[PDB]
Amino acid sequence: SANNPWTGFQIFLSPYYANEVAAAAKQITDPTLSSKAASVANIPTFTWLDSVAKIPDLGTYLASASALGKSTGTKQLVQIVIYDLPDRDCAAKASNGEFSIANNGQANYENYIDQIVAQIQQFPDVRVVAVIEPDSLANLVTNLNVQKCANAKTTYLASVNYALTNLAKVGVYMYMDAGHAGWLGWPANLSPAAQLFTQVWQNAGKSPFIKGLATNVANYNALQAASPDPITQGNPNYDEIHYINALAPLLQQAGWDATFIVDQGRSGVQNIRQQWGDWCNIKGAGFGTRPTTNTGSQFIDSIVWVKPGGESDGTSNSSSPRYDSTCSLPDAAQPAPEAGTWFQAYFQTLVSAANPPL
Template identity: 55%
Template sequence: MTASKFLLTAALAGVAIAAPVIEERQSSCASQWSQCGGTNWSGATCCTSGNYCSKVNDFYYQCQPGADPSPTDSLPSSTAGGSEPTGTADPTAAPSGNPFSGVNLWANDYYRSEVSTLAIPKLSGAMATAAAKVAEVPSFQWMDSFDHISLMEDTLVDIKKANDAGGNYAGQFVVYDLPDRDCAAAASNGEYSLDNDGANKYKNYIQTIKKIIQNYSDIRMILVIEPDSLANLVTNMDVQKCANAHDAYLELTDYAVKELNLPNVAMYLDAGHAGWLGWPANQGPAAQLFAGVYKNAGKPASLRGLATNVANYNAWDLSSAPPYTQGNSIYDEKAYIHAMAPLLEQNGWPGVKFITDQGRSGKQPTGQKEWGDWCNAKGTGFGTRPSANTGDSLLDAFVWIKPGGESDGTSDTSAARYDYHCGFDDALQPAPEAGTWFQAYFEQLLTNANPSFL
């Protein structure tokens, strides 16, 4: 359902291909923000002057403004920025109870750079001012490929400097690189395949993250584990790719949770949303699956609970059901988590807590025609700001997990990762590749934000 979440901006791009110097009058070169390369791409591979061709992922290269930056190593040294590894967790970094309490959340430079270099230059007046405010909202940083682990360390270097100067910040990250990832969707296929040693490559990915976390054991870290993976095992076993990945998903999720069970870490397994696993027929099997992961991993202390509504649009608490919820009495995330908590306890996971993504849930109802229309839905807006003040004992925090403005998937039917959901009437179009900056979508979120940024 979700997709590779990162766009390497001119300020942060670590991998790029050089664009040849070609005069602008040569119309064969791609214009700014257009595609200029990628797997199976047959179009222009150069950019008009003043732009360079930057690798976003293997499937998509994009013409971005500026000069081609010098390539950098894909993964910095574990002591980047001068910070030294530490052997044991700082007591203030180890969460006791709600990990969102007693700390400030960090607004990472990656998303700030996307907004400042891609969004704001196309805006003016009140919209530009409002966009600058969005850039300062703490959102999760996605490690959706091995190369993007370096962005985690970049952020931790920044947090350490701030904390050494008297701050008290925690980092928020998404672990998202399972082999044959997102088995029921095409838009978000990842870099690893089970047929090409993907399991061992994923274990190396986890070990690399683990070492970085251990090197910054004085910083509290909050992790969301593998969006969409376990939920697909509940509802999509009729999809051959999901059936084939079933055992590997469970084995590797178990591996990730065990290896990342560290003193300064709090983890939340992704648990879909009300419109996915909230249906009566899905709640029981979902609770059995999630509780099974918890027990099979040895009931790790760092596994705090479940994350819901990741990259989706559901409200936290509604007084009436939107028409596209199709008669389900569980039509918001509050009802969903209160339905799931007792079932999880019955299956051997007591005391489960939740977080819910409200980054794109500000406008209700949305423009969705069907509840399962997940791709770049029309009629959405930025929602409730991240906060541990939830007023609900089951909910640890409102969070922004999906970076608002990054595309869910391309509407180009000829693209290798085209998913038909991205071509529906209720999906904003034309849309670029998943993870690529989608200016029109950002502006929609900003215009419809509730509370407003304007």
């Protein structure tokens, strides 16, 4: 499209990920690998607003970005993930969301959005790009047979709508999560997905700030695969570019000339999964293509690092109340700590296996 949110902006680097990476790099004993690891702090990632407790951090990042812009002569851009739906991750065996549909989930989520908007409103000289609710709408395409998802459908739609409608009022550029090629990219899922995303876009007023969709968030697919990963058998859309090429025209027909961003933060190593749906701490993952607007596709505004590589996807301890057995599969790195917390061994392998090399 004409307006790529990233062009002409300097991405604000997460200080939290920078601190995690710096602390991680000094534990890496090999001096050469340690310095490659340290350099990861210079690679832009998305900050996950996975709870209300993260909202004050958003405020600090906006204010810091505003001051950095002025100190360096640049316009700054802060990258966030909106990730706090009630009954979050409805098809998972476990979720870490603080809100539940049964306990005023929708009102509580609206207040979470209101607090985010109230921060963003104070810093108009900082641009914000937001990924909207990973692991949400995609479940409403393929997983309505999951009773928790069926029961969450109206709340997911209403809450995502509230986020889109109100973040648009403060000029946030938004990409709705849209799963990945092995979820919604199956040819038979493309039209139901397009119908859902278009309805969501319509309900939120077709705001031009709703730029399109984010794919491969927290996943491991190739953007452009040299040869199909065996996990993809039966799906001609075996990588993200095939998925996006197939989905984009369906959105365009509805009057939404949507563009896309693609997570590649853990895509450096292909052919590491036994089944395509295995998502938790996949062993042997490497850092992938660094974020860039040089995407190789008319439809793709940026390759991004949404999931911050090195933060666990979930614990492998079956005694945890948050335990999801996906995290104990043979292709999941174990033992693994609780979701979101630092997983040092996994980070070190992400560095060692980075492709392109760091």
